[PDB]
Symmetry: C3
Subunit: 310 residues, 3 copies
């Protein structure tokens, strides 16, 4: 039980500052203690200085390629995460990455899949995060990771992303909690036949059935490793207020953690990303605690925490 | 895909002013744009001036027949809605009526059923709205539409309602979300064997099963048209605060819209009423937005909006 | 249909004052009227003066035996409740006990089981309340009733509890809503094979299935009497704010009452405790009303109240 808590305080995939504080806030609530307490030999892995990056990000408005914003900064930072997550996995340790916005998944998914080539990816998010370079309206890269990972709109992806390995295939991605998918993304999921479970399926079949369906979808031989990239805005704003792109009608606090228990129960989780926690996006310091604690709760539940004896 | 958005700014079936602002508020949030955006050729249908009606209503306290309040005003306005909804349906257009309190269902149901005689009616409400003239304690007519439509307590229904066609039979009504039914109404539903699904059934079988049961109940040949009269107070006050008769323990925001998706999916929806939105019954202008947006959301989901590709 | 509303204004099993006001507050909201209105011939049973007890409790800090706090006061008061609940049951009347903290279950369970020896016990709580004398860290007895009732850690239970009859066996206890069980309690439930249904099971199977499983677990011949000890903190703080030990991720208001309806439906409920309502633990006098009304709602639903005709 070896684990490497990968700290990825990045905010370049979006406009709001504060999300890069997630790592720090999570570790403050005792993330590592919880993990050690769960029997994991933990080690912190800092990939870069969040303060420096915020500095170079804030200033440089010239970092753009048409609609896409900060492709240079994003490509540079996510490549460091890739190298760190790749290394962590090669050493045989479990990489738990704390963001930071979802653009970091470029490095996490790339890193994990380049080591566990047949690993399935369960993307827990209210959004599809699959906007192509030409398609993205806002130009925020935290909503484009999967397009770049799947190598979509090839011709328009900046060369500064030439380092991204083409290891993710559409039949190895499964979404859970979708409810804010735009027209371009709807067509993509449909044309690529990507297993996507919206809030409609949750409401229709219940979270237990949805998780089972999601794990099956990316697990042919039913024995492949599984990775989860958890965007906290999948959970209803009621419980997860401090976040950049909230969307009403999400998972209840209970469903958010039950999902984790089912994956833990699975026994094949090989990696986990917990992203989009922006403490600076809350009114009361209570919203901040509700949010960050939910993060630590996801980590604990994913890594073994059960309500009863085990 | 022809639609007529019937504007019914009426508040005579109850005591609180503000509910007649629903139409205006809904159209402000872009109700018609959403509908056109969903592929419907829309047309607004104003049946009467909400300002004038509020004026004649406010003043005239003499409009009463024992317990029943404003039977003259209510009978006159609902007859105009009947004629408008009847006309809209005859032209082969889909009538989407925005209230206004639920007393307007006297005209909507009468209008739709006089054109589609075998149309089933799914009444989404926390209340049964079936108090008889002699039975109604409060005398508010927004809680009596179904008694008059079913022709109950015949002998005591004012003659100013003589225009109401006897087109609704008890085996063509199905309730969803019931939780505030009074003793008289409990006996009625039971003696008339009306298919009623309370929050108990939702909690017991889940919203998916309940909707299926409701659609079946009013669809013998399983091919009859279906009409939905949606009272927003069916949804828990948590999400729908600005409303005249709130009742704790309602449908979650998710269930409120999933229900709509299932009906849309059905393919036989022939009419829809969205009622009881009172913007003037909110503390923060946030309660107002939560409420009105939920209204537009019901319309979009009922009329075709899906979370994924379709 | 004879009932005895047992008033147990006790707070000695915990540190916060205010919980002893539950009885008074409940009766204020009309608890007895509701019961009579439900067809029960009610009678109030005061076992002791809540004001006097609070007085002797507040002062006496010397009432302790190591970690355990107020074992003398608790043992004395719970013995009075035992005698009262035992008497009420012998007279063939239904004992509805209103607390007061959960330490009162020492007398209720003992009283009911000494009359209905084969009665099952359904403990609705977020906590296991089974800490042993040596195990309890906080020393608060409202978290130790079941250990004493099951006669655990015998050797360390003060002799002032020598009156407690050994009538409860582990195969006659079933938990519902568990989510804050400590390590000692986890081991105990596991070693004793006690039927426990955590929020995990509720999220996984739904409340309907869980209740059925719980009733089955303590009902071998499927015809045994059933008793329910209802701790209100089983319900999510969102709905039940004013309480001593809140825990996030609980039963929704709907599940809290549906559970009651299923037990009522069962037809074998022989006793009910409603505990942990502390009015003095609320910010707005709204939290207080939300909480206390939920209490009366549990009593009504348990005792027969249905949403539709019956
Ligand atoms: Mn995301
Ligand atoms: Mn997202
Ligand atoms: Mn209504
Ligand atoms: Mn209603
Ligand atoms: Mn308890
Ligand atoms: Mn408890």
């Amino acid at each position: 039980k070896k684990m490497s808590i990968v700290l990825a305080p990045f905010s370049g995939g979006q406009p709001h500052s504060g999300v890069e504080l997630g790592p720090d806030y999570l570790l403050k609530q005792g993330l590592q203690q919880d993990m050690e307490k769960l029997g994991w030999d933990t080690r912190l892995e800092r990939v870069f200085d969040g303060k420096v990056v915020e500095a170079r990000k804030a200033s440089d408005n010239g970092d753009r390629i048409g609609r896409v914003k900060r492709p240079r900064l994003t490509a540079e930072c996510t490549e460091k995460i890739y190298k760190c997550v790749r290394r962590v996995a090669e050493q045989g340790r479990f990489p738990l990455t704390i963001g930071g916005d979802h653009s970091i998944a470029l490095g996490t998914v790339a890193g994990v899949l380049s080591v566990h080539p047949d690993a399935g990816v369960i993307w827990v998010d209210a959004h599809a995060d699959i906007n192509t370079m030409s398609g993205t309206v806002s130009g925020n890269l935290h909503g484009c990771p999967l397009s770049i990972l799947l190598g979509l709109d090839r011709e328009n992806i900046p060369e500064c992303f030439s380092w991204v390995p083409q290891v993710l295939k559409p039949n190895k991605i499964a979404y859970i909690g979708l409810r804010a998918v735009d027209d371009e993304e709807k067509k993509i999921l449909h044309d690529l036949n990507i297993a996507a479970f919206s809030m409609h399926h949750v409401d229709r079949y219940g979270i237990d059935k949805v998780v089972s369906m999601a794990i099956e979808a990316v697990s042919p031989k039913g024995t492949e490793p599984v990775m989860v990239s958890y965007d906290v805005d999948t959970i209803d704003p009621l419980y997860v207020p401090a976040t950049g792109t909230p969307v009403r009608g999400g998972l209840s606090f209970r469903e958010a953690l039950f999902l984790c228990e089912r994956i833990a129960e699975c026994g094949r989780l090989v990696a986990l990303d917990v992203v989009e926690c922006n403490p600076l996006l809350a009114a009361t310091e209570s919203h901040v605690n509700d949010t960050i604690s939910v993060g630590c709760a996801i980590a604990r539940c994913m890594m073994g925490e059960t309500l009863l004896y085990t």
